[PDB]
Design a protein around this ligand. Structure first.
Ligand SMILES: [Mn+2]
Length: 75
């Protein structure tokens, strides 16, 4: 998906609660489940990518971190 598309999806779930410019791990799980169900298949690397990308260790990732996460978890 294009970044413009990806931004709209990210915002929709981040808006659920907390900071509208961050996504917690649970918000990311609901987002993948409904938007990219195929990315949640077989052994997962979600927690490893999540831990590496959440640099400030606050349990949340920014839009650019999310983009990287979708990209990497896909290959
Ligand atoms: Mn963070």
């Amino acid at each position: 998906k294009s970044p413009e598309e990806l931004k709209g999806i990210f915002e929709k779930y981040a808006a659920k609660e907390g900071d509208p410019n961050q996504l917690s791990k649970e918000e990311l799980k609901l987002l993948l489940q409904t938007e990219f169900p195929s990315l949640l298949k077989g052994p997962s690397t979600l927690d490893e990518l999540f831990e590496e990308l959440d640099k400030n260790g606050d349990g949340e990732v920014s839009f650019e971190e999310f983009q990287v996460l979708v990209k990497k978890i896909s290959q």
